[PDB]
Design a protein around this ligand. Sequence first.
Ligand SMILES: NCC[C@H](N)C(=O)O
Ligand SMILES: NCC[C@H](N)C(=O)O
Ligand SMILES: NCC[C@H](N)C(=O)O
Ligand SMILES: NCC[C@H](N)C(=O)O
Ligand code: NA
Ligand code: NA
Ligand code: NA
Ligand code: NA
Ligand code: NA
Ligand code: NA
Lengths: 161, 161
Amino acid sequence: EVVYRRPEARDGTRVWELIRDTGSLDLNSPYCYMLLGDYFNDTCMIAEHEGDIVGFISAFRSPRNPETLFVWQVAVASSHRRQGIAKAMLTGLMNQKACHGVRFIETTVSPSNMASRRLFLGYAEEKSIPSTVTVGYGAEMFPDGTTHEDEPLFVIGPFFN
Amino acid sequence: EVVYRRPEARDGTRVWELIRDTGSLDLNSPYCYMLLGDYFNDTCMIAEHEGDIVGFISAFRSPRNPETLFVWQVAVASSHRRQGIAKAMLTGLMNQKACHGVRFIETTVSPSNMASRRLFLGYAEEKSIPSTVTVGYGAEMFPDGTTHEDEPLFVIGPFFN
Ligand SMILES: NCC[C@H](N)C(=O)O
Ligand SMILES: NCC[C@H](N)C(=O)O
Ligand SMILES: NCC[C@H](N)C(=O)O
Ligand SMILES: NCC[C@H](N)C(=O)O
Ligand code: NA
Ligand code: NA
Ligand code: NA
Ligand code: NA
Ligand code: NA
Ligand code: NA
């Protein structure tokens, strides 16, 4: 009964509202999410239940390295936690029609983000694929006048050779 | 004496600070700008003068249509207006090493954004290339509880056939 689809530009505001409700994430402009649905919809997903958006994932193929999928934001409505929605979304991005397969997933996961860490490391373990965690963007790179955790880099792959 | 370069992830915060100072633009997270410099640096530019970032442009090749360059944000520090910095940045994105040439520029320009409109329409006129303005994202697509102008779609091209 949760249904999955690609976003469209018109979903921008309802996606933004979901991100704003997901305090673990850094909120971008509404326009950013319109853009994601207009231009990056092949590498993003929405989950919907009873009208409402209950999940979103944003991602893109890296312009330099088209076999690398960068996963930007994973959001699941607080009402719909622990139902497999994030894993269904990620599986959706990985089983699709693209020219190039996904050889690597890259993403950053702050230490507090337990659910996201278990999503990615659990996917890697299920598939028997290596995962590496390295310094990504440290807290010290963030603006003065704002508090932020480290964003360590997770690299999942190679999925194939 | 203004110098132009591709951004890097480490420029994220100083770029964010510039956007935040550019009230015509919608401010994204600092993390967004780190990402732009890490993954999209081939289609972004920074202008620097006496240490300070005085200009930035963000853009990407459309994943579906790699000959289309989408120009996302154009920012010029208030101290450095009317010196050709935006035009130098855009020229930079258009004269480079990519696999595919830029057949179309797409961008949105709200009515209040006079400088940006003259940038794009003036570039098109200089090059003798058509420009079209159509409904892009209307004010009505934006969130309740927030005020926003229309974002009409500008399509500049074809630059070649
Ligand atoms: N993976 C999330 C990275 C960042 N904290 C964001 O919200 O964009
Ligand atoms: N980011 C992963 C967490 C989410 N509750 C889910 O499991 O669907
Ligand atoms: N061209 C700018 C589009 C939008 N107002 C932004 O700031 O992202
Ligand atoms: N967005 C264009 C305006 C900027 N002052 C410039 O001309 O450099
Ligand atoms: Na924006
Ligand atoms: Na869930
Ligand atoms: Na899940
Ligand atoms: Na972000
Ligand atoms: Na200028
Ligand atoms: Na200019």
